[PDB]
Every structure is written in C-alpha cells, then in structure tokens.
Amino acid sequence: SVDQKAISTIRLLAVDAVAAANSGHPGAPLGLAPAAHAVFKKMRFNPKDTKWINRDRFVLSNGHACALLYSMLVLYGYDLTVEDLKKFRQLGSKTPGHPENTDVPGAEVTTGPLGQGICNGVGIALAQAQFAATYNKPDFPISDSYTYVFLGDGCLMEGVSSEASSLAGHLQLGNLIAFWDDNKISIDGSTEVAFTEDVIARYKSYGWHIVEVSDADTDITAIAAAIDEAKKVTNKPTLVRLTTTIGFGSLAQGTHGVHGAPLKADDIKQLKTKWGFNPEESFAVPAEVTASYNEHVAENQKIQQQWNELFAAYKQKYPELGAELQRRLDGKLPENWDKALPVYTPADAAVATRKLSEIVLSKIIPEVPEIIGGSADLTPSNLTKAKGTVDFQPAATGLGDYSGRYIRYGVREHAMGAIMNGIAAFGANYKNYGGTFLNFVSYAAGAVRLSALSEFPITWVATHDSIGLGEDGPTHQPIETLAHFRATPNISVWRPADGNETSAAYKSAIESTHTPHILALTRQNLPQLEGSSIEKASKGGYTLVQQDKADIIIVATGSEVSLAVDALKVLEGQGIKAGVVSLPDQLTFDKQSEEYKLSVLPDGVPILSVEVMSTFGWSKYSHQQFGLNRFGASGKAPEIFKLFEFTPEGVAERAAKTVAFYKGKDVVSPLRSAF
Amino acid sequence: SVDQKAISTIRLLAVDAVAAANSGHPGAPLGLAPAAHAVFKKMRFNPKDTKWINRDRFVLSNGHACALLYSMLVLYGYDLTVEDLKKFRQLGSKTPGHPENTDVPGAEVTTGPLGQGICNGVGIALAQAQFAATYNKPDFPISDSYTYVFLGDGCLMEGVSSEASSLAGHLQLGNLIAFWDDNKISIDGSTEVAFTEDVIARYKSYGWHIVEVSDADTDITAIAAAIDEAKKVTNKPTLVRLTTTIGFGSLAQGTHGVHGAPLKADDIKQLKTKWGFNPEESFAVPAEVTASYNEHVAENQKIQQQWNELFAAYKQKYPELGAELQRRLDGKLPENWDKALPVYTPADAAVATRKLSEIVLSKIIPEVPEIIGGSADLTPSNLTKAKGTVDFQPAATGLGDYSGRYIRYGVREHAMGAIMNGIAAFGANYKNYGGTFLNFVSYAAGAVRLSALSEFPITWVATHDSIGLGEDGPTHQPIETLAHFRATPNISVWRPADGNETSAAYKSAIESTHTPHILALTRQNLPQLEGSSIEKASKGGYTLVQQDKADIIIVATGSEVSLAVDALKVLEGQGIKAGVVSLPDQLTFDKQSEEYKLSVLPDGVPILSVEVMSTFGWSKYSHQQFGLNRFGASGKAPEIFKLFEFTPEGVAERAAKTVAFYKGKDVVSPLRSAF
Ligand SMILES: C=C1[C@H](CCOP(=O)(O)OP(=O)(O)O)S[C@H]([C@](O)(CO)[C@@H](O)[C@H](O)[C@H](O)COP(=O)(O)O)N1Cc1cnc(C)nc1N
Ligand SMILES: C=C1[C@H](CCOP(=O)(O)OP(=O)(O)O)S[C@H]([C@](O)(CO)[C@@H](O)[C@H](O)[C@H](O)COP(=O)(O)O)N1Cc1cnc(C)nc1N
Ligand SMILES: [Ca+2]
Ligand SMILES: [Ca+2]
C-alpha cells in the first residue's frame, strides 16, 4: 500500500542520511517510522507556515533519532530538502546531529540532551491550555491543538522527565499525547541491566492514561486508534507504549549496535530489496508518497484557512480580546507597557531585591497578559505571585483554573526550566518565569543551557543570591553560580542593586525575544542608590559615581554596589578618590558600543571588582578582583560579611592596595585586548 | 513512659534550638521525633566511634529538619552537646542550619539540597552490599549493616530521587530502609496544589517493598514493627510511609507556617505543659532519657567490641583478605600501587584520552580492590569498564553479582553523582568513579557541588570534552562546563593532554581523600608529548617546552597542548620564540609553592592561554586568552577547529598579536596581585 511505501521511504531516507554522514543513529528511526507516519497523518500543520498558532506540535525527545524527524519534514515539504539530508551532520547544514529549533524548520525545540523534550512538551501543552482558556469563546475554538511527543528509554530514566510527568498528571493535561519507544535497548545493552521498573505502573501513579500497542513495528491502525482513544480522555495526559524492534529490518535489529552507528552497506542493500526499493539508489522519494503526503498538507492548509476566517470573525465579535490576540501573534508587547515599571529615588526605603521583584510583578502582570510564571515550591520566599491572581490548575481540582497565571511547580527545578522552554516554544509572545533560590537554579542546568542555545526568552527569578541569605548556610549560598551562567553563551545574568535596577532587569527580561534571563535577587534589604535609574541600568553597566580625578574605580553588582559606595567614603578619609560603576548585567554591557563601554571603564585608572562570589569572569572588567572563592557559612548574614571582610573597611583596604600596586605603572582599560 | 518522655525531649530540644536562633525549621522535627526515637533505638552505632565500619547509617535527606538530627546526636552522647544546640545556626557552630559531614559528628553526608540524601543512602547501601560480598565468609559477617533514610515530600518531587529509587529497586538493595514523612505540607501549602501522584504505587513500580504506618504521630510500636518487617524482605529496598502531622503538638500544627519559621513563645509554653515539661525551662534533658539512651549505647558498644574480636578472628582465618580489609580501614592504598600506572614516550602512538583512561582503569582495577565505578549508559563511549570484570548486580538477575565492580547506572547522571557521594561516605577507602560526557556532568551539578562541600574523593570520567567530539553538535559540546566546576571550591578538574598526563590525573584522583575529581577526556586522538611525565604533570602545571629567551609563553590544556606545540613551530618561522606550559589541573597547580608557580609562569614575558572552551578563569594564568565563548557546531571535528581558528596558524597569529600588544610594556606574571 502507499502507507507501507511511505514507511519504507522514511526508514530508508533516515538510513541513507546516516550512511552519507558515516555518523549518527539509525536504530530508533527504523523502529519509530510507522509511528511517525501515523502521528503526522493525524497532525494539523502547515509546512509553509511553521508558526500557525493552532498547529499540533510534535517533539522528538529522543533527539538522536533526528534523521527520522528530518525525513518527515522533507517528505511533507517543509523548508528542508533531500539535498539537506545528504548534508546530515555536516558543518553548516540544516540537518545537524541533534535537532535545533534555531536552524531546522519544523523543530519546535532543541533536543539531544535526554529528558528535555518530553518536559518541553509538557510546557507546550500547559501553554496551549492557558492560551485556550484565555481566548476561546462559544463557537470560537481559537486554540484546540495537541502536543505529540516521542521519547525513549533514556528519557524515562532521566529524573527531569519524572518531575514533568508527575506535574503534567497533576495538571490533567489531556491534550498531551506521548509515545514511548519500548524497544528494550539503550547504549549499555538490554534495559534489563539498569531499567527494570514497571514504567506503565509508574505513569498510572502520576494520573496518566495508558494505551499499549504491542505490534508497533507494523500496526499503524492500532497507533492511529491509540491517538483517537487519547483524544477522548480530556483530563489526563496519555502515554502510548509502542513496542518496537530497534533497527527494525536491519540484520542487526534488536541490538545495541544499531542504536548509534551507521549500518553496513550490505545491510542497507537487503533493507532496500526486502522493501521493494532499488539497492543501488539512495535518498529515493517515490512520487506516490509525495502525493499522499501532499493531500494531507492541502487538507491542513484548508483547515488553517478556515482558522484564519474564524480569527477574523472572533475579532469582530470580541474586539478587545481579538486585538490582544493579534498583538501577541505579531510578537509585540502592549504599547508603553514599561510605564508600569516602578521607579525609586534615594529618599525611598531600603528593600530586598526579592521584594522589589514582587512589586514589579504586581504592577506588570495586570498590564501584560502574556506574562505567566511560577515557583518551585518557594512562592512565599521568592515572592513570585502577584496578590489576587489565580493559580493555573484544572478547574476540577477547585484550586485554580486553566485561565490562571501562576504555576505551582513543586520541588522540580529542572522540569520547571524545561517546561519554561516549552511555554516559550508555544509562542504567542509568552514571557514566562520560574522562581527558586539561585543556588538551586544549578539543579536545572541541563534546561538552562538549552534556553540559551534555543534562544528562548525565559526568566529565572533567582532569589537568595549569596551569603546574604545567612543561616541556611553553605549548601544554600551560591559561589560558582553566576560564573557558570555568565560563561554560558547567550544568558543575561542580572544582579540588580536597588529598585531602579530591578525595574531595568525586568524591562530587559520581558522585552527579550532571543535571550534567557536570570535575575539574581537578595534576601536582605539594600538601599536605594544615589545615581541609579532605569535608563542607565538598561545599558547593563554604567557610571554610578563619576570621579574625574579618580585614583581607582570600583566596579560592583547587586548588594556590593552599596558596599562600594560606603567604601568610597572610607577611601576619601585616606586621601583616595574613587569612582563607582554598577554592572547589573555583563551580557547587556558587553553588547553596548566600544565607546560607551570605555566611558564606563576608561584607560588610565586601576579598576577593582567587588562581588561576594567567584572572581571568574571579572578580569574582563577589572585589574584586581575582590570576591569569595570558598564556600559560605551558617550564621547571621552581617556576621558572614564581616568574617570575609566584605565591609567598607575591607573593600577600602584592597582598593588602597590596588592603587599602590599600580603606582608608576601604565594602566589601560581591562576592555583592551591584543586580539 | 520513658519512651514518651524521650520523644517529648527530642521535640522540645529541636523547638528550643530553633527558638534560640530565631531561625530554622520546627515542623518536620516535631512530626518525625517518634520515628527518630524508634529508628535510633533499632540502630547499631557508637557515639564514641563514628567510623565503625559495621555501624548502621542514618541519613536525614530532609536536611532542613536538622534540629531533629542534632537533638538525637546530643541525647546519645556524640561529640555534640546542649551548648552546641544553643548555638544552632550561629556562625562557627557545630550545629549549622543544614547538616554538614565535615562539621557535625554523626552526620554521614551533607544535606539541605533536597533529593540528595536518599540518593546518598542508595550509595551507602550499594557500597555495603559490595563490601559484604567482597569480605564476608561463613561465620564471619564482617558487614551486615542497614541504611536508614528520612525523606520528605520535597525529596520525592526532585527527579534525582526518582532516578536513584528506580536504580535501587533494580539492584534489590534490601538493607535500605527509607521513611517518607507523609505530612501533606510543603512550602507552597498543601501537597494537593502540586504533588497528587500515588507515591506508594510509584515505589511499588520500582520494585520497593512498602509498609504504611497511619498513626506515626504516636505509634512507635508500629514504626519498630515496620523496621522488623523491612529486615525480612532481603531483596527489595523498603519505603515506610509515616503519616504524620507537621508541627505535631503546636497550635499551628498541620500548616505550612510551621515548616520553616520559629514557633511563637506562647506556643512553646503550651507544648511544654501538655508534655509535662516546665514552660519556663529550655533545653531540658531529663536524666531518665539519658539513662535509657545510655543503655542502648552500652549495648551497641558491646556489639562493636564483639565485632572487633570477629575481625581479629577473620584475620587469622583469612590472612590475605584480612590484611586487605585492615589496610582499607586504615585509609591506605596498596603499597606502590602507582607502579601499575601506564607510562608513555613520544615514540608511542597517538591515543584519545578516553582510551588512555580505559587503559589506566584496566591496569589499576586489578591492583586496587577499593576501586569500583560505572557509567550513565555510556560504557562503550566513555570506556569505563575493565575487560573481564563483573557488573554489580544482584545474583538473582544472572547479570552480575554484588561482588562485582562495575555499575550500570542507566541514564541517571544526577543520581550517579549522589550515589558516588554515598559510596565515598560508606568509607573503607572506596575510590569510586562515574562516567558520562562532560557536557552532561552538568545534569548532576547539585550532587557535584556537594562532593566538593563534603570533601569526598569521587571521580567523574567525563569524556567527549569539547568540539573535538564533532558531529553530535552543540547540544553535546561543552563551553561553560570547566569554568563552572573550576569556579567551585575544592574541585580538581584534570584535562590531560596525553598518556603521561592521564596517568598523573588518575594518580591524583585515586590518592585523593578530600577532593573530588573531574577528568575531562577526549573523543579524538592526541599525540604523546615531548616533555611530559607523570612526575611533572603531578604538579598540576609544568613547563613542557622551556625557552630561555621566550617572546611569549603559551599555556594550554588537554587537546590544545599539542596545538600550542605546533604553533611554536609556526612562530619560529615568524622569528618569535615561544615556550609552552601544560596546565592539566588548575587546582593542583594553585596548591604548589609560590616559587614553583612563578618558575612556570614567570615575570617579564607575555602569556597567552589556549583552551577550546570558555575563557573564564584563565586570567589567573595568562595576560591574553584564546578560547571559545560561543556554542559549537555539528560537523567533522577538524572542520570545527578550523572554523574557529584553533589551528597552528590561528594560535600563532594571536601569539604574534600578543607579543606586539606588549611591545614597550612592563609585564609581570599573572600570578602577581595587589592583595
Ligand atoms: C545515553 C545516551 C543515549 C541512549 C539512549 O537510549 P534510548 O533512549 O533507549 O535510545 P535508543 O532506543 O535509540 O537506544 S543516546 C545518547 C547520545 O549522546 C546521542 O544523543 C549517544 O548516542 C552518542 O551519540 C554516542 O554515545 C556517541 O558515540 P561515540 O562514537 O562518540 O563513542 N546518550 C548520551 C546522553 C546521556 N545523557 C544525556 C542527558 N543525554 C544524552 N544524549
Ligand atoms: C522547597 C524547599 C523545601 C520544602 C520542603 O517541603 P517538604 O520536603 O515537604 O518538608 P516539610 O514537610 O518540612 O514541609 S525546604 C527548603 C529550604 O531551603 C530549607 O532547606 C527552605 O525551607 C528555606 O529554608 C526557606 O524557604 C527560607 O526562607 P526565607 O526566610 O529565606 O524566605 N526548600 C528549598 C529547596 C529547594 N530546592 C532544593 C533542591 N533544595 C531546597 N532546600
Ligand atoms: Ca531504547
Ligand atoms: Ca512535607
């Protein structure tokens, strides 16, 4: 039949791509081609409009199986061709060895690191439920799409997927349909060596629905029926167990050797002949497969055309909601939304930046409907919920509604991070955030790095940034954390010192379209600074205190800016004139013009950095660095600062030593380099 | 009864400690005091010998509940007193806000970051099973101890605990007995808001045994019976569901407000009067409680005295095993074990450092019985198994034996990291390791940081260190990873360039007693270097190529040392004389004498670093840095190096620019500083 021919075509495109690269993973593509064919035939999508907001989404969580995804996208006429398949895994191609959303048309998210994609699918489904609850009206199903995820044994072993699956079951996300490639083989061999749990019983315990397909090597009728069954279960996510043979058809089917290396040439020949293809030909695309797939595309395009007319009718019936939806689909924030950001003066009281963050959220959430977010069981400590908002929960629980704006992630930082990526991936201008303590953002590093690589504008509300948290002690106090994330490409790491800087950090985070943000916020109170403003802090680094005859400039962030200002006064008593630079975001600063940056960090003056954590990175901006390169301590925070000499006198002493060290030396800006 | 009085004493010590600090967590201590009393009465331990190798171990995974642990340790006469309890959460005390094994006698591991302790308990239990299988003989139960773990809802939400619980069930670890504080309250309120899964059904799916105690606020008889029941189930770890009231006894019992803040003074008064204590007194220790607990200590000490005689008899009957066991309990490696380390010369073939690592392991595993380790489903890629060894598996599976030495962790990096910490915590000189790709060590950051804080000599065999891995692409290629871990206190991060340096890295990792190691290893082949040796690489940094009239020194690591040597030759053709420094471990180098370090990085010469990852940290050792501060690419590795100009010509160009930039400048070593 044409369906059988399509499945063989998919299998052989994937195998031929791996062969051409002499690199990659043929096993799971061979095993999952029937399911991929069946799922894509049920999906609504437009190859010519990858951003249609009511499309069904597909996520390949087992991203090593990407030759399968690329084959589907090519066959359906996305902006990806057989010539791109021939360049699989080659430098600069549109067919990299794991899918990247920035590079591959039709790749919703970036996968490859196991466990991430299923969690991203939870986030796409969470966003779809929130979006539908916000906009749908009687006779106006603006959003009614599904989220389909493929995943393997490795994804099921990774703890992040357990976190997200527990939460998705709690959230009753009935438009999520996941498919487990139950092939009993991972890199180390049989799953009997390490993975003998009853997966299905575990997913039932989370509140998922289960469908089992025992013959998924051939039974596409049962796979399609499993989708139909899943769609009838509107209050549970569904896991479809696909019992497959890894490498189905290969001489080496059912072995670990077919997971991750190219097939032998004679194996590929026998695959082709058994399936009616020419063993002398590679990258064959039978025209009857193209015709069948084109029929489905044409039907999907008529569905999108009708959706566009539904949307036009919605704008007439619901003028305000319709204009809001249009603005969001255009990628634009509300006009002048930033007028809601709080502004402070030096006459205002000292406030912790966690509390300043709460106040910002309180003001901007009512103004910007596409902001949603939550906390990983730290709501009363991170201060991430705006009073008067409703939680995102299924209404059946009585605890919230899908129209809610605040997510109770539970103690699940890693899944929160990956779910945030999925909410961003949904689109519709979602600007979403997640709270935890800065030190426990590290639990989510796998997902955070993917926010950066995927260019998603997610925001971590990362409170309790330092030893300033006090008594909880060194297991809670960051040292390395900012260096880690600042060293990752494409992460804006804001460490605001006061009210105006906190508003600038949020302006950046919400306006972002391609850069994730981490906002490092304090437990302890900090004064409002003389010289701060949203305008200057928006530059990432700025001259807080200008001193034309400076003997030294002190550059600092966060809680240490006030310390630097106090040190300036001690230094004046010693006959040393200092300037102060505040550097709330190194990435934003780096992106400013060379001339602006040199106006902040000029030649001809020693520069000392002060920040109560690792000194790594700081030589970009300073000649000498005063930091904390050891673990913290459990005690009252002011006593810890005193212990480590993060006091006005301790900073002044080091500043004076810095001036002395450069006596009779020619000093150029740290911004200069040889290349 | 005296048991009731003991439980009240524990509760009130914990409450009084929190009150004195005006900080900390009274709720779970109040709820878990009955269980703690019951468990400690069943445990075998010596307060005067915290390292008895056949002790039962206790782990408080819900580490915020530490006032409970400290109260137990004080009551049992560990080296911790009521005066230390009065200093709870105060700077420098022996009673920090979360337990630290380095500081607190009787704290086996460091907890506070949720999820870790249960995984550490899995590792203690894994080690005990391996140890018992190695040493026990008929009539000689050298090791027969249990591992008891307390854990809360937050631990059960964290994905790391799911990973370890799946693995522990697979491994049939029947001497592990965990207790869930089922109090239905976390920081965000009722667990109904985020955590509605059927925990018990999930643990059954992992292959655990379950005991439920519905009245754990009072029913110590049932808690003791649950322990007895668990001990009869020798082939499954057990989860005991303790249904408790958080804050039991408080006016505010059963609320989130009692989780994490001190009780009101009037609440503490009514607690004391209802339990027969004086509301005017704090830190009361009734002498009848001390007497009862002392009776149990005395019995335990007689058990240890008999164990010492068993051990002496074992040494007579089994002289070789007995001497091996004695050496391990003394903390000493085999005499001259390091003679087994492979040595290379520049005439030997090029080898990837992952393969050099395999060869080291092959030679040292047969010589050093306390080495065990595994991989997170990457055995054939990390090359972490010595041929001819048997896997650690329950014999009932037919797949290994508990005497085995190689652990199949599955796709579980974070749990692997925390399990490694537990194996180290067991003691007996275990030197244990875990393989994954360097980029996915980041999945385990929560545990890695605790290896550093806890001072455990664990080792990550972290292959595929860079863009040199090639086609798998940027989701697999580290950029930030070494900077992250080098910025963490107390992590040795070895990036060996060749065979001799790889042997030095293992010498350091195996000899370690207080510092975790990460060995960053290549996929791609590297040449044997002229000038390398185990002796010089053991210094962490050394002069590979000395040039008395150097115009520049190039400092490099790993794969970039050979690149630097090739660049030296290009530079010679340009009339520039370079030296080369190899810096295989920055931490080890930093610990050398100032004079040694200055002999490697002298004054008076520009220094350029070369390493194909983040430049963060490198200004400690260089004036200019050539690194990679962007994500990688999917393609053949040599093509990626060429793209980013990590070629002999690209390094030479930057070296020449560096020489030019310092023309007419006075240059001092990067090792100098102002303070
Ligand atoms: C454990 C698995 C994986 C095991 C997955 O087992 P599975 O999910 O059951 O998939 P199959 O049914 O296809 O067997 S896949 C993976 C790769 O990195 C690919 O993403 C791996 O295959 C490498 O490409 C390969 O080892 C390179 O070989 P070499 O020639 O360089 O030696 N991988 C590593 C991995 C480990 N941990 C995370 C978080 N993500 C990952 N991708
Ligand atoms: C979510 C929980 C935790 C929630 C645990 O719920 P649970 O396990 O059910 O414990 P209970 O039964 O006692 O309620 S505990 C924790 C703390 O950091 C303590 O370790 C937290 O209590 C802080 O001390 C507190 O928020 C500070 O308050 P503030 O005055 O500064 O505002 N915590 C944070 C946490 C989050 N993630 C990880 C990995 N580890 C953690 N310890
Ligand atoms: Ca598999
Ligand atoms: Ca709880």
Swiss-Prot record, chains A, B:
Q: Does the keyword Kinase apply?
A: no
Q: Which GO terms describe its molecular function?
A: metal ion binding; transketolase activity
The UniProt entry, under SMART domains, shows: Transket_pyr
Subunit notes for this chain?
A: Homodimer.
Family annotation (InterPro entries): THDP-binding, Transketo_C/PFOR_II, Transketolase-like_C_2, Transketolase-like_Pyr-bd, Transketolase_bac-like, Transketolase_BS, Transketolase_CS, Transketolase_fam
Which NCBIfam families does the entry mention? Answer: tktlase_bact (TIGR00232)
Q: Which GO terms describe its cellular component?
A: cytosol; nucleus
Descriptive protein name: Transketolase
This protein's encoding gene: TKT
Q: Which residues bind thiamine diphosphate?
A: 64, 112-114, 154, 183, 259, 413, 440
